[PDB]
Design a protein around this ligand. Structure first.
Ligand SMILES: [Cl-]
Ligand SMILES: [Zn+2]
Ligand SMILES: [Zn+2]
Length: 582
């Protein structure tokens, strides 16, 4: 307890000795409270004018317009200790899974060089602003690396001084860039060396890309077995137990030397013991601590969530198949049955899943899985929007299954070849592209962000009539050579100044392992749309008077945006579409 967290607490107290006070009206029940001190400060969603002026029909659609306007009662909850049988199942499964993921991979430290190159290319490292201004500045100053060095040698000694979280159905725990570096040095290998690629992990989809996910779900659908289950957990990060954090820490059993010691310190000192500062308007700063729940950098969070979800879903599969009778206690012979199941069919059972952090799709051996709930509930992974003991409802058609905020369509090209394409309600797509984050955007930077959205729509959502037209309009309205940008960067093949038809051919034909015929497409007119009724079902405005007037008059909208940006070199992409081709 305070032997591991006291030093961080001590150090903060001293910096605010003028304001330290144990507030008696503290709201915390499940977090340990330590003290408060004096502060005063707040990041709203800003509208992208380039995208909004080229999507006029959506100006009167509240599902779009409300997205730009405007659970900490879930962070302050507790999870009970799992039963002895559950703890045994989790430990056996986690031991087996780290070994499988480690068969073709070697754990290793990530470098100052790799970290530096990440900060110098706008990767979201979830850091806090104060001695240096930006991350770019800290990394180019040797004083920083000496602070890093002091902490590093403290971690080798099994102690922590400066690794403190700042809190802000979501929750982002920002840390100072130094604490983020030390996390990346020790555990960055999971992401940098693709431990959760589908080739390496069989259930994972890390690095796969939205153009691959539908093909992966269709391949799972080809297995013999029951319905496809896609159960969402209520507040996954808040249901990570101390037992889960101890099973995740077993990755260190595969390490050696300095690396082993630096990783053991991240898990012990920052994950299994956390120090957090939170803004309360009563504005003060609260210093609180706890042992359990997920609070890591977003990229390490993704890999450990994927690990623990793979573990939880294999155990749910074991329960459905009758491998064990009760979570109260595993007999010695059930332990051997469980290990033997993993060796015999574990890899096949992983291939029945698609798992992206807390998001899963599972095609079990049969539908006993639907009512196999004792281990899942006792591990704390309680299903969202269903009563605790009500059997899961599965999907009978892979094209209906939700995954990574999408569903997937099978789309047949005029030439017979089959595309499996990503989709979601079109109001969500248009409303997101109309929003920016942060201050000081120039008109050029705003245009280049609109171009990023447009090129994403051309590559992923070309099959939606309204998005192909709006993408062509935005690309016509932004100078042809201006480079697409994002401040907050999976595979992003639309982030390029290469011709989008060339990129479409590379992604959907040349490099697509599910497309046997590699004949290139010569024009956008060869690339199909959803059926008109299906496009409407998925939120198209095709058929509305507002949409018809927008489509007819699109050159007027394009010319409005060109007049604002000024006298630049532009390309007309509208004649790539049959209706503007004379
Ligand atoms: Cl269905
Ligand atoms: Zn530390
Ligand atoms: Zn759809």
């Amino acid at each position: 307890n305070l032997d591991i967290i006291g030093k961080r607490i001590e150090k903060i107290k001293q910096e605010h000795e003028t304001s330290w006070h144990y507030d008696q009206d503290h709201p915390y029940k499940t977090w340990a409270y330590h003290g408060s001190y004096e502060t005063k400060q707040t990041a709203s969603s800003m509208v992208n004018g380039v995208v909004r002026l080229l999507t006029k029909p959506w100006d009167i659609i509240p599902m779009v317009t409300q997205m730009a306007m405007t659970f900490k009662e879930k962070v302050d909850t507790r999870t009970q200790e799992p039963k002895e049988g559950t703890k045994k199942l989790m430990k056996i499964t986690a031991e087996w899974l780290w070994k499988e993921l480690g068969k073709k991979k070697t754990p290793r430290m990530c470098t100052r060089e790799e970290f530096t190159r990440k900060v110098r290319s706008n990767a979201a490292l979830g850091a806090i602003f104060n001695k240096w201004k930006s991350a770019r500045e800290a990394v180019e100053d040797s004083g920083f690396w000496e602070l890093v060095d002091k902490e590093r040698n403290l971690h080798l000694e099994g102690k922590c001084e400066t690794c403190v979280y700042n809190m802000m159905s979501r929750a982002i725990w920002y840390m100072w860039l130094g604490a983020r570096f030390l996390e990346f040095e020790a555990l960055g290998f999971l992401n940098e060396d693709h431990w959760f690629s589908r080739e390496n992990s069989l259930s994972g989809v890390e690095g796969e890309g939205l153009h691959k996910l539908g093909y992966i779900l269709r391949d799972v659908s080809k297995k013999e077995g029951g319905a496809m289950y896609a159960d969402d957990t209520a507040g996954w990060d808040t249901r990570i137990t101390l037992e889960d954090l101890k099973n995740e820490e077993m990755v260190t059993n595969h390490m050696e030397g300095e690396h082993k010691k630096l990783a053991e310190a991240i898990f012990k000192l920052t994950y299994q013991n956390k120090v957090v500062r939170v803004q309360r308007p009563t504005t003060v700063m609260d210093i609180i601590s706890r042992r359990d729940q997920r609070g890591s950098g977003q990229v390490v969070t993704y890999g450990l969530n994927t690990f623990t979800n793979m573990e939880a879903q294999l155990i749910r599969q074991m329960e459905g198949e009758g491998v064990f009778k009760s979570i109260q206690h595993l007999t010695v012979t059930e332990e051997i049955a469980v290990k033997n199941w993993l060796v015999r069919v574990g890899r096949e059972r992983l291939s029945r899943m698609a798992i992206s952090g807390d998001d899963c799709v599972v095609k079990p051996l049969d539908d006993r899985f639907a009512s196999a709930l004792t281990a899942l509930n006792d591990m704390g992974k309680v299903r969202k929007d269903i009563q605790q003991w009500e059997p899961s409802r599965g999907w009978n058609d892979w094209t209906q299954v939700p995954f990574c905020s999408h569903h997937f369509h099978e789309l047949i090209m005029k030439d017979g070849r089959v595309l499996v394409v990503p989709c979601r309600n079109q109001d969500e797509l248009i409303g997101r592209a109309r929003i920016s984050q942060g201050a000081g955007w120039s008109l050029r930077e705003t245009a280049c962000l609109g171009k990023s959205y447009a090129q994403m729509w051309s590559l992923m959502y070309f099959h939606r009539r309204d998005l192909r037209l709006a993408a062509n309009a935005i690309c016509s309205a932004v100078p042809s050579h201006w480079v697409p940008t994002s401040r907050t960067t999976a595979t992003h093949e639309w982030m390029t100044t290469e011709d989008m038809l060339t990129v479409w051919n590379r992604v959907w034909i040349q490099e697509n392992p599910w497309m046997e015929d590699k004949t290139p497409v010569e024009s956008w007119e060869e690339i199909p749309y959803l059926g008109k009724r299906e496009d409407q079902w998925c939120g198209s405005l095709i058929g509305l008077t507002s949409r018809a007037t927008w489509a007819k008059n699109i050159q007027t909208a394009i010319n409005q945006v060109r007049s604002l940006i000024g006298n630049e070199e532009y390309t007309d992409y509208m004649p790539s579409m049959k209706r503007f081709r004379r």
